[PDB]
Structure formats: structure tokens, C-alpha cells
Amino acid sequence: IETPITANFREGLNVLQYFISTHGARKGLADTALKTANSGYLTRRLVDVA
Amino acid sequence: ERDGLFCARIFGPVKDYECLCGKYKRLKHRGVICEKCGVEVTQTKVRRERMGHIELASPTAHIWFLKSLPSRIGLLLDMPLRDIERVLYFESYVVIEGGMTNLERQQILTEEQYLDALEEFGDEFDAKMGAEAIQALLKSMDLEQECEQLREELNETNSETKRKKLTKRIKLLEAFVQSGNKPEWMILTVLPVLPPDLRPLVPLDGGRFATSDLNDLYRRVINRNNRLKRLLDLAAPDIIVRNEKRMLQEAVDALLDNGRRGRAITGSNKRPLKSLADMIKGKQGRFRQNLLGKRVDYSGRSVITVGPYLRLHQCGLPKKMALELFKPFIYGKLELRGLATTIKAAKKMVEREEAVVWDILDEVIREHPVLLNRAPTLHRLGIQAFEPVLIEGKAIQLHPLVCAAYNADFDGDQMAVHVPLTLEAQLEARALMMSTNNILSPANGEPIIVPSQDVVLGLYYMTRDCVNAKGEGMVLTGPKEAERLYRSGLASLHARVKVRITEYEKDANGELVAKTSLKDTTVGRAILWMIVPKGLPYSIVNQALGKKAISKMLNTCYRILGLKPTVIFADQIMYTGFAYAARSGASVGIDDMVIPEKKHEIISEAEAEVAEIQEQFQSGLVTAGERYNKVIDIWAAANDRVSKAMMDNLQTE
Amino acid sequence: YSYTEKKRIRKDFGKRPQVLDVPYLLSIQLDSFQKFIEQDPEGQYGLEAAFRSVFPIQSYSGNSELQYVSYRLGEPVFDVQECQIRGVTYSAPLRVKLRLVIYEREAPEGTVKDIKEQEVYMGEIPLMTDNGTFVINGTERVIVSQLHRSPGVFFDSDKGKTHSSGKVLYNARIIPYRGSWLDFEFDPKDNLFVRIDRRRKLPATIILRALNYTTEQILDLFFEKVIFEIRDNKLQMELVPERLRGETASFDIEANGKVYVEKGRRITARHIRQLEKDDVKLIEVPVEYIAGKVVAKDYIDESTGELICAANMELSLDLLAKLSQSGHKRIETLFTNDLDHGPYISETLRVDPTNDRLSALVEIYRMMRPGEPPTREAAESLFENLFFSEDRYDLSAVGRMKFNRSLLREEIEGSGILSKDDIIDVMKKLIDIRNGKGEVDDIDHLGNRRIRSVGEMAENQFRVGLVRVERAVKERLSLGDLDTLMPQDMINAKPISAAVKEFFGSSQLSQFMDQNNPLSEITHKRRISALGPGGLTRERAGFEVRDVHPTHYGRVCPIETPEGPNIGLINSLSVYAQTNEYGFLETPYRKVTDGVVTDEIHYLSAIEEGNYVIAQANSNLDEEGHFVEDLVTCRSKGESSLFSRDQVDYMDVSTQQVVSVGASLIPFLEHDDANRALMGANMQRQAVPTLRADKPLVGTGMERAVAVDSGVTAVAKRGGVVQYVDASRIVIKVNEDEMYPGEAGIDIYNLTKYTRSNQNTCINQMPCVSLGEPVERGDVLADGPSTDLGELALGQNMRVAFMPWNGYNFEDSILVSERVVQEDRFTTIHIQELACVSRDTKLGPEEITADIPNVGEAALSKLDESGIVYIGAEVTGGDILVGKVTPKGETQLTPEEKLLRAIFGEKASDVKDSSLRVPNGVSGTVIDVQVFTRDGVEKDKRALEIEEMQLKQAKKDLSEELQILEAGLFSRIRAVLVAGGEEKQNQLEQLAEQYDELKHEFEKKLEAKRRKITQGDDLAPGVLKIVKVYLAVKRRIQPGDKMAGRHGNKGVISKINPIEDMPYDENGTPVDIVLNPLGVPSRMNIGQILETHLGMAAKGIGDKINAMLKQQQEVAKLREFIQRAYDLGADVRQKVDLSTFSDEEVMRLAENLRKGMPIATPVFDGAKEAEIKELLKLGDLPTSGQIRLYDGRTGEQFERPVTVGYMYMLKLNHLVDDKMHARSTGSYSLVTQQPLGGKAQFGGQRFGEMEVWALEAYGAAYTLQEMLTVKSDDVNGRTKMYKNIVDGNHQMEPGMPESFNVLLKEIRSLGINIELED
């Protein structure tokens, strides 16, 4: 993004920084959830190969 | 019913060794059938093995062999799938032999083409409509005759494309003929129905035997068969009998494999319809039931919990859960000692839960492990055996070191448990699956069981130094005297000092060489050295001992000493680390997270740099593309300066 | 500060003032259903529009019709109280009026003899409750607000991997509200296409040909004309200056003796400008240039009489010579260029086989419905009824507005069904997007996302019922000769009733109310849902839509979404959100006209927010609402940047606009991360209702809002004074307000004392008011479950100290004290649900217990004479709640059997037992027993006693009112008659007659109430008597139970440690909880730490107030300290002072303020760090916020100063009693010999193929085979293994698996022989 997150968790975070940061939590949750399916898919075929 | 989908005569009887009418209803007469009624006598579970059939009026075709993937009916006859699919219905017939008339041996044709062709010749040439055409063409096409022509044609025809294509067809035809199964058995004349008990009628609300997906599909095949069977006797016209043949073919096709077709029901309060393919498939191939094993006897589960008191080779198994898990062994143990007179009396005592029954539980849970297991089994460490420790509580007490192997956070994630019966499984559980044996991981050489959070924090708290403290400069004999000063609170737990310590070492070939020297080491390091069992060097203890160094000490002891002393040493590190953490009492507050004083100065410089870059864009020099790269570099650099300011301030001030 | 709130006030921080207040949170459910169920005299989204669509209908050219005038929702059969307890649907009769008409044969529009009969009975549609719930069969259910793509055009992109060769797509999908989907998409070869209702692909030229257009008109409508003249036997054309741009010059361009552009160089701006300025429309072109461009229109020979060149075909040297030789001056041919006007329509016409309308209609009908033969009637009907039709197809007001807005039309509204011009416009617009101009529309933008609701969903399902019966009415009207018995018989109740009841009865949208928490109750209603009927499925899409978008900002919550498979699909509604009239979600903004910020608000829609610029909430307001800062931060069309002061058109209404109600309840939200804020919000919903409802110390603001709006706490209808306070009922005299038409006396509110909820939780209201305290309008009377003093509780505040303790508080575990479990704070009450109803067999009727056979005296003693369990008895596992005796006799009494029956004496003769028993595991005590005996069967002793209890309850409250109502007439006479005691004669009878009429109204009202208890007998066919026992059970907080906070910090209890071992401060008060320090650095949740520090200062100030109250320092000392603590800091956060210093109110305020004075910190604009430090310093505490907690078991002091405070804990509903289970021997499944299910009966714990690889990794094969052979399948193996373990010999005989034998039989059943050889 253009404007970076200036304020910390110790200080009072503004609404624009939270509304920007919520994408990282939502996308990060989806990628980690999708990675769990990829890990289960990867170990399936590697086990079946040998 | 007399001749239904559940039946006495066809399928099998209701009661164990009894007729339907009730003439022969005894174990003495167990061979003979019934005279009045039509029913044999047998066990209650004889229906599940027995089966029947359904005589089809028109010759039908199989669902898989028509489609599947390569089309076994098509490649055997040597023809395309599109023409064969149209030929299987009743819209476009296929010619069955006849070289006299101007037409191919397997030539498809429209109703108009059939009408025009029949007007000229009529006789001599022949062409069946539906699946009877494929059934006629199947038995006519000889495998041995075609194989002889293919062998001669391969050698004679000198070509790349001709020889390559003919080789694949000849090998498939030869393998099909050499096996045993002829082409005529692909199309279905008879249809074998499934056992009744393996497709049971589940009762609905109010006790009504609702028809299952099997029973509805088998009912459809019987209804269309009984329709078509009469229509041939009645001598119905070509349009009505052809329409019945389509719906009979669709009913059989839907029963055998419900997919890539019309599809019955489709989301009508019961999904599609359990076909014979979908039962063999089920949950994406029959894995969970047959291959996996499904649920197992002598099994249970509960919510996990912390267990620091329990050592590395045991776990806190619940008292109420463990009573049910070893239920057969309590009957044997009670009857062997002579408390319970018989099995009926032994059943009454354990159900009522007397005081004597609890003492028997501990007697048969000493040398009998329990296989703990987490749901997401990533690797071999996901299942492991432990000695069952009796504890008053429903929550299962997992070990601290084993938690790292499972990756089991204690936030409402229940771990299952299994009871290994017999001797060889208990021997395999104690030897192979044991936590004391399974110390090192399978993937890497480093140890799986290691210090994580509380042990690592307490080890750093103990093994540490400072600028100045109470009782710094003072020599002392050993760890016994050093512990007395530290525990009493005269000397500090972390201070600069120098005390003696007899550090052993295995220098010679199979011998413990002695040594002693007044080495420089802290008060906490002197007290922590007692956990190191003799052979380990003094250099490992006199350090920070934070995560990597702590884990390396366990790995070094395993190579030098062995499995036995490292198992004890790894446990004592957890006990010492857990106890030392309580002594320190660290706590991340609000004022603890101290931000840097130059954050406002750095933010002003970073913000001013963005204005300078923006000033160049409106001026003329800077462009839109260059502004994105320039602004991102200034913002990224400012984050590094802010992070380095906090890193410089918080680390050493 | 009104009443109830006067008892206890929270010290609210946060500098942002609330200009626009928080509205009624459960609006979306009520206002949508209010639009549905209401008499509207105009075309709006409601019941009249559902009728009027297919209200006036007529027979198949018969001149017979039945027009609908209006409807009338009658009175409910039972109210919400009676309907819930009995077990039926809460609904009102729909009295739909009608008017039959019949025109005369061979005559004009004039009726012979009409019969306008009474309103037809069209079932009973379900009504909505006060709080906003539907009662289906005595259970509160909620319909979630559906979300999907709105009706209208939408040009999708589908770029990237379209054809796997770096080729982007260009498709458009005209989605309707009702009808087939009109999709059109491109191809790899740049050809047009169409797909009717997501079907297989086909040519686009079949669509236009079906709607009456020729080959020449197809090219003319889509495509430049480009005329080619023929002057003096030579090639010429009208050379457009703009046409040559973006192309190489083939021939030498000249005009009137002047070379404009030479044959070689490209047509630049200088070349095009010369032709346009000079205005030369006559350029001499060559014959070779016309070879590439195809001809537009046809041109047959006049003299010869033959087709020279057909329409839509490529020209040539031979073709051009034939046209010129014949004598053709004009010659049209398509611009045709790769830059702008691409050859899409011309190429599509060549590939399309059908030419005429009959050929195109037959191909279109055959494509959609293959198999059947096309014809004249079928082809025209199928093509017409698909799109151009009223009954089948319908775009509606939302679709026509969206379609016109996308296509850039003048008119806002118009016709519902599509036309030839609209489809041609969509085809032309789709070709432009594929060419270059006009960018694609995004799916994540909320302008396209139409948010439907229960009101709109009920209107659709009701419309399905009317079209179903309409076919029956049309067929029946034509068959019937005379118009008699028409309106009642025609409009059948079953089609209308069964259709609409199926939606509320069983669907994806309509589901059970998640009622284990007032916050979970209110948030389930305020819920957006993507998945369901209409919207996209989970497997259908999994990208873009799941991710959060920038268009939200107060329409739906970015933070609140369930972590799992549906991550981002199930969105939560915001705090200040509100649905628009059209359909889309809105959000309020303050209208900033010029520099001064005005007070008037405005609801901006998703599409309307883009063009304007909106300022942020956190901004420094100057005098008269002026801009303090020069360059304030103002978002403009997604992106954020520092805009000007005067440029700001709009601004934010409140700081808690973006955050939802559940997210706003979390204090110090900004200090925590979005990941942990998402997790903490979800755990806040699952909190079980506590016994002792304690108020939160660290509040926020939405506590008082959620408690009143959810409908847990009993809010007052009209203000007044309390007459009689009690746990059962709370009456109140109105006095000031009163009833309108005289009469009346006082209000009444019967509190629900101990009742079962949806998720087995104890719902129990408690009175908070005094014996005779004054109360105002909109004030709490009785506090509901999980509430305290008119505010939301959820859990309880407990003392916490972050420190390690012997490895007990590891990872995510808590080390609670014995003082917590001993006080019975975290202990919670549950409510089970048992029932026994089976009867009506062929042998006889099943009796209700009446002393069952083959049972001891201990079993029979617990049951009464009728055979039912007593009120309040320890029902252990195995005991009989409700008895039974089934008729399975008639065996013919032999001499031996007859003597045995007479001597023993079990019952009537001989019967089988099927009594209800308590499940082996669960236990508790019986609190209530309901009996629903069917009509016809005589009522037993228990049923009459329960009916008499409800009758005497109904007698008491009605008679209680009569004491006030009858006294109004009685006491009035003694006042007037004593003054005048000739005159009083005529009026004396009127006073006595009016008194008797009021007394008769009591008897009439009591008879109706008494009858409703008797006649109210809901029962199915084959059901005689139905008893339902409710077993209450208490379960304390134990090791293993779930417990968490609001900041995303889950916990499980390790061990209940005695209070002597726990840490203690200087004063000697032992801490309750001990959390882990290690979790706070990694998981960014700084609000959890800040909540503890403010919580310590909150308790520290409260302990001072309790100390002042204990020592007794009078009103002078308490008033001075209370006023200073209220303000505390210095900023601009409202800060309401003492005002007047009340006498009674100040003393009552100090009592509730003791033992922890609460303080509210808002979500976004919460309490500061310096303000919290001053609060700690005010009530005797350090700035750092830590104390030297000495060790309990050791005695000595700790090394580091441990932080101490009161972080808010709440016990989640995930107990060990439900979770824990074991097994050994029991019931197996019939089909495959394996454990059936899991919960109860027999064990589960699925091993799976994953754990098999773990066992194989070690290499213990004997351990692995014992799972799936010895202890699972094989008939001889199970008996051998169990007997061997019983004898103590061990070993095993596994044999073959029975599940494998089924696999062979399933393989054998499909004509594939498989068998075990040898």
C-alpha cells in the first residue's frame, strides 16, 4: 500500500490502519487453511508412491 | 413378501432357524425346507451372504463397460464411442454384417437412412436397433479370427502408422481372449440383485419402513422389466416397445452407476441415488470403512491438559474412562482372585462400581501401555504409547516434552486413546511406539522431545549473568553449598562468580576420566550443573542455554552417553526449568514494551521524504511509475530504522 | 441518566462524541417482514405485489376470471407464550378476498350474474415475534439474510487461463430475478457465442435470427457502413478521415489533385487532419483493397436474374468484376479493423448454420431440450416463453434499474421482460468490451451484491404457491359450466400452505436460533450469508468473494467472520448499518456542506460512495464544526490520501461505524491484532450462561444496547410505579400514560422461571427492581440470562496474574483457584429434553404406565399414581421417568398359563415393557413435566393436575386485575353517593349495569383462557398421550473445561489448586487465575494486557468506595470522591458529572459501585495509556501496574514484580461431560461390522488410513492388525478375542474381515465375478 502502518499495538491504532490490516488476517487465514489442504494432498501421493 | 426385494423363498428367513408360516421352528429339524410355505431354515445372518436375480426381457448393457474411459465395448468391436452410445439407445441403429448390400460391417444409420435402405433390399442385409445389436455384434466378432489377421497384417504392411496402431489393438485383443472373459458377457442378460441385510430398510419418523436408494432403484428396474416382459407377449408396436427399452436401459444404467447420464432425483430431499458404483466408491473410494478400519474397540477420547508432575514415559489416564477401556480384564482379574463367583456376578459388581473394583484396575494397569493419538496424524510421532497414570479427572494429562511432537495446543483439542490387548501388541507398544525410545525424530537428527516455552524461559532465567549483585565475588566448594546460598536468598541466582566443580569426561576408550578445576561460572549455572549426569562437559552449562543451545545439549548427551541417561536428563531439565520459571516470575506488562524515543523524529523524516518524492511528480522530473518504487523504498527503509531503534533500545539499556 | 442506569453508571472514555446514536440493532429482520406483512395501497415489495403479479387471471379463451381485491391477516390462534409451551406454529389466517366474473358469449365486457363471496382460507402464514423470531413447532428459529449477485447485466473478465495460451476472455451474464440466465462469451478464434441457462455452447447468430432479423440486418445492426461508389467505370468510396487511423496505407491516397498520404507510411494524425480539414468525401481506391473487407448487404442481378454476391461474404477480383459489369453504383461493405471495430458479428454469421427464423428457433429448442422433435408450435413457444414473457421471465424493478444503469440508459424504470432492442444492445455492448473500450465490472464491489432478507424470501416462496394453484384454477374454470361454489372450492389451502411452510420448516436459510448467549442471539439475526438457495455454493467458488473488499466501511464487518471452511462467506452486520429501499446495504455519513460540518446525516449506497470524498472519524473539530487541520485524511474511491479542507463533502458519523456489535463489545480492540480479534469475537458467542451474573468492569458502550435490543431482559412497556414485585411476575401501575378508552389498571410481565433453551442452557429471568421503585419508559424490569443491572454480562470478572507456575499454565492453559469453584461462580445450569410417546397398535392402545410389570418397589415408589415422575427427584441413570405397557398378548390361556397369570398378577393379563429410562451416563433432577394428551382420549391424573395448575395460574393474574378494575366502579359510588345521601335514579341503574357488564367480561375472558388450556391438544395420527420430562443438571467448573477472554486467548483448566498454594499480595488476597506470559509477545493482543491494568485501577477505586462504605463516612465523603473519579482525566469525552448531587441516588450509586467500579473504553477510540495511569494513581496503585506477589507453598517473595489485574474471563460451552467418552463391548452396525456412529451407545474414535501409516512407520504389524481385524470385524474373532482376554490367556484369532466380504458381494452384484482362490 501507499500509506504504511505508523502506529503500533502499544499506541492507539486508527480505523484506516485496522481496515487495511484486516485483509492480512483474512487472506493469511485463507492461505494457511489452503496450505493445510495442500499438506494433506502432498503427503497422500508421496505415501502412495513408495 | 412372497417374491419381493425382501423375501423368505428367494432371499432368506426372518428368525434364527424358523419357517415363515411356523411349522418347522426347531433346531432338531435344521436341514429340511417347508412343505406348505416356501422358505428354508438357517441362521439370522444368512440373508447378508445370499442373493437372487432379475430376468431382463430385452438384453441390457453395463454402465461401466459402455463408458468407463477407453470404452471396452467400443475398442473390442473397433468403433467410436459416439456411434456406440447412439446405437445403445433407440434413435440410430447399426448394421450387423452383410457384404452384399452397399454398407459397412459396423455402420451407424438414421431412421430415415434405415427406411430408405430397407425399401431397396429389405432381405439379406440386417440391422438391429438397440443394445441387442451390440449383443449380436459382440458374439459375432471373433477374437481368434481377428488376432490371426492382425499378425499377418503387421508383417505385410510396411509402415510406421499402420504397424504402431495395429500393435496396440492386437495386444489388447490377445490379452482379452487369453484371460477367459468373452465379449458376449459385457452386455447383461441377467442382473444379480444385492443381499437384503447389506441394503437395509431404515425406519422413518413414526416407525415406517422407508425405501432406501438401493430399494428405489431396484424397484424401478423390476417395474420396467415387468412392463417390457408383458409388451413382448402383447405384441405392442415399435414405438412403445422402444420407449420401454430406453427407460429399462436408463433404470439399469442408473442402478449400476449414477453418473455421466440422466441422473435420478437430483437434490429431492435425499441427494441423487446410491448406485452400485457409489457404494463401492462412497467417501471418494472405499477407504474409511475397509482400508482404514473405521472406529475401533477399546477406544476413547477426552480434552487435553497440562501434566508437569507426570514424567516423560507416562500420562494421566482418567479413572472413569480407564474402567470401561479395560472392562474385559477386570472380569478376568476379579474371577482369578475369587471375588466374583462367575461372569454374571462380575458384570453386576463393575456396573454398580464397588470399592474393591478400583484396586483391581491398578493391578492390570502397571505393565499395560495406552496408545495416545491426535486427529491430524502428520507423521509417526502423531501416535505413541504411554504408561497409564490413574488420576481423578476427565481431562487427559499429556506430557510436556511429547507436546512438541504432537503439536498439540491445549485450547480444546481432544486426543484419542487406545487400549492394546494381547502380548505382542503390548510388547510392540512398549518397544517400538514408546516415548522414551522415540526421542529423536524420523525426519531430522535433532531431538523431537525438547524444551519449548516454560523450560526455555526458566533455563535462561537460571543460566544468566549481570553487572553486579549480592554475593558476587565469593569462592565456594560445589553445587551443594552454592544451592544453600541461592535458595536461602543470600547469594543472587544470576551473578558473576567462580566456584569449583569436578567435571568428568570420557576421554579414554570406554572409561570415565576424572578432572577438577576452579572454573568461572555463575550461581545459577552451578546449581543447574547437578542435572548434567557426570560425563557432560562444563562448557555447555556455563552459557545462556536458550532454545538452540538447550536442544543441542540433549542431542550431545544422546551421542556421548546413550538413551537411558539422556531420557532421565531431558526430564530433569523440564523439572528444573519449570521450577526456575516460578522463582523468576516474569510478566510482559504495558510499560515493559518500551518504544523508542526517536519514533516521532523518524516518522517526520519519513513523511517529509514522501512529500519530496511527491514534489518531484508535480514539478516535472519524477514520473508515476518511479514514484511507486521511490515511495516504497523510503517507507521500507523507515520501518528498518524504527525496528533498529527499538532493537537498539530494548536489547541493551 | 434515567432509571435503572441511575443504580450504576460506567465512566465512559473516548474523545469522539456520539452525534448520531446507535439505532435498534434487530431492525433488518423486523422492517423487512413489516414490508412483507402489511396492507400497501401501491406497487411495493410486499403481499399485494405477490398477489397482483398473478392475481387477475382468466381461462383459455373462455371469458371467465377470478380477480383478487385484497387480503386480511386475522387474529392468531395462540399468542407467543401459549404457542411456545404447547408445541405448534405461530401463525395468522390469511383471509384472501376475491371477485368472480363471467362475460357473456357473443357480447361485450359485461357480467351476467357475479358472485363476490367471502374471503378464501389460504392456510396460515407464520408471523414474527416482538424480538424478531419465528416459532415453528414450539422452537424459536431465525432466517439469515441471504447475499448474492443482483439482477441485471455484468460484463465479467475471466482472464489468465481461459484457453491456456495467454488469451483473456470477454463474457457477459444477464442474470434475472426470475427466469433463464442469458449468458454470452467469446472464443479463442474471436467469434461470438451464447449459452441459455448455463448450457452447452452455441453460435450467437441463432439468437438474433430467432427474434425476426435477416442476414443483412444482422451485419447492419452490429457493424460502419462504408459506401463504395462507382463513377465512370472505376472504384471509389466515401473516405472517412477517422477510419484510416491505426492502419498502414495500402494505395496512394489522393483527392482533387493532391496526394494526402503516400502508399507506404502509416496513417498518422497529420494525414487524418488533412482530410478532415479539407472535407474530402471522394477518394479513388483500388480493386485489391476490397478483397479483405466483406460485403454488408445482398445485391442480385436485375437483367440476368441471379445472386451475384450474397450478404455477409468476402469480396474478390472475380466477384467485384461481376458486380461492376452488371451495373451497381452503391456497394456497402464492413469498417472492419483490428483496433476498434473487430470482426465479431461477421465471423459469427458464417459459422452459424441456420438462416431463417424457423431454422434458428428449431436449433435453439433442440439445443436446450434435445431428444424430442421440434415443430411450429414448440419452437415458437419455447423461444418466446424463455425471455419475452410475463409469467415465466421477470427482471423486476431492481433488474431494470441495474440493467439500464450498466448500459447507460435514460429511463430509470420500465418493462420487466426483455425485448429485441435490449438483447441487441447487450450484444453490441458485449462486442465493445471484447474489442477494447469499456472496462470490466468487479464481483467484490458491494454495488452488485444484493442483500436479500426474510421478508423478500417469504414473498418469493409465497409467489411459488400462487403459480401452482393458478394452473388448477385455470383448468377447473374452463371445465365448470355455471359459476357456483367457485371461490372457496377453487383456491385450495394445501398448495399455498405447504409451499410457504416448507421454507420455514426445512431450508438452508431458515435455521434454529443459536440461543446460549444474548450476544449470540442478537448477532445470529444480524447475519449476512453467501451460501444457500440462489447464492453461490462452497464448491462452486473459492476466490475473490471470500476476501474482504474496500467497499464495506460499515455495511458488513471486516473482523467478524467464522474461522473454518466458510472464511469470509458468512459476514456479520455492522453496528450502524441499515438496508436501503432498493436492496443494497447502506451506511450513514454526516453531510459536510462547505467548511462547516452539518448535523444532518445521509445514507450513502455502495455505488454512491465512490464519486464523493469522505473524511475519517478521528478528526479535531474546531469552532462551529470547522476544520482544525489543513490537510485532513479523507478516503476517495477506495484509496486513502490527505485531501483538502474545503474539498471534504462527507464525514464519518461515529468511531464505531465500521465495527459490528460483537466486535464493539471487545474493549481495547485497536491494541489487538485482526487475527486474534477474529478469534476472540467467535469465542465470545459460545459463552455458556453463568449462575451469578456479574457486571463487566472493563466495558465498552454496547453492553446496555445489546441487553435491551436482544430481548433477554424484560423491558418496561409504559412508565410508572411498581405495585407488587416478585420472582414469578412483576406488575406495575401506569397512572400517567394509562389506556386510551377508559378502563384499565396496571401492566403485567410474567418472568420465565427456569426453562429449556435451544442449546441446552438455563434461561432464567430475575427481578432487579425494588418493592415500589419508580420506573420510566424503556427501562429494564427483570434481568434475563447473562445480564446484570440492564447490561450484557456474558462471563465474570476474575483476578489474574501473568506468571509461570511449575509448568501448569503451559501454552494455552489456566491455573484457577479453589475459591472460584467453591463460590459457585463459573458453575452453570443446564436443561435436558426427554420424551415418551408411542401408541395406537393393532393389538390395542399402549397405556401410560399404571404400575408396570416385572419391576421392583424402588422403581414404582418414584412414580405417582398416574405413573409419572415427581417434581424434584434425583433421577439417576436407569430410573424410570415415564412408564409404559405395550399390548403384545392374546396368546390363548392354557391351564398352566392361566394359573400363572392369576397367581402373579402383573397387569390386565400380560404386556411387554417399553418404558422411558434415563440414559446410562447423564443425571440430574426433574424440574418440569408437560403432558400433551390427544383429542378423544380421556385425560389422566397428571394431565388434569398440570392443566389445573395452568388454569389456577390463569385464574390468579386475571382475578388480580379485577381487584383494581372492579374497585374503580365500587369506590367511585361511595365518594359521590355520600354527598347526595330523587336525583340518583336513572343513572343508578347505569352504574350497576356497567359494573355487571365488566364483571361479565371477566367471566367471558376467563372462559376463553380456561377453554384454550383444555382444547389445546396438538397431536399427530397414531398418538394418544405424549409426556415430556425436563431434567435439570448442575455442572461446576472442573479441569478440562473451556474458558477464554475477549482478546482471542483460549484456555483449558489444568488443575483446581487450593488457595494456600496460590500466590498472594501484601494484603493477603489470593489471585483467582494465573495466565501464561509467553502467549502475549507472539500473538499480538496488547488490549488483553491493557484490560488488566485498567481492571486493576477499576477494582482499586472500587475497593476504596467499599472501604468508605464499610467505615461509614456519610454522604459528604462519598460524594466528593465519586465526582473526582467520574471525570478523572482532562480531554473531551463528554464526562457527565454529579449534576445536582442527589440524596437517595448517590447512596444507591455507591453501593453498586463497591466491589469494582466499572469503566467503559470504546472499540476504536478507547482509553489512553496516560489516562489509565492516572486512574491507577487515583485509587492507590502503581503506574507500571504490578505487585510483589509472594509464593503460596514456598512463602518467600518472587524475583520480578508480577503484573496483576482483572482481565475479563468467560466460560465457553465445551465441557468435559459431553466431550469425554470410552468403550469396550456393545452395539455394532448391521451393514458393516463396525462401531455405529460415536455419540452414546458404543464408542467411536475413527482410526483412519492416516493413523495406519503412523503404525506402519514404526513397523508394529501385530499392533496394526488388531485394530482392523481382532477389535472390529470377523464374527469368530470378536468372540475369541473377548473370551481370551476374559480368561487371561490373551493371544488372537483374527480371520477374515466381514467388511471385506461385503466389498466382494457389492462387486459381485454388478456383474463382475470376484472370489478368493484356493
Ligand SMILES: [Mg+2]
Ligand atoms: Mg491452536
Ligand SMILES: [Zn+2]
Ligand atoms: Zn412353513
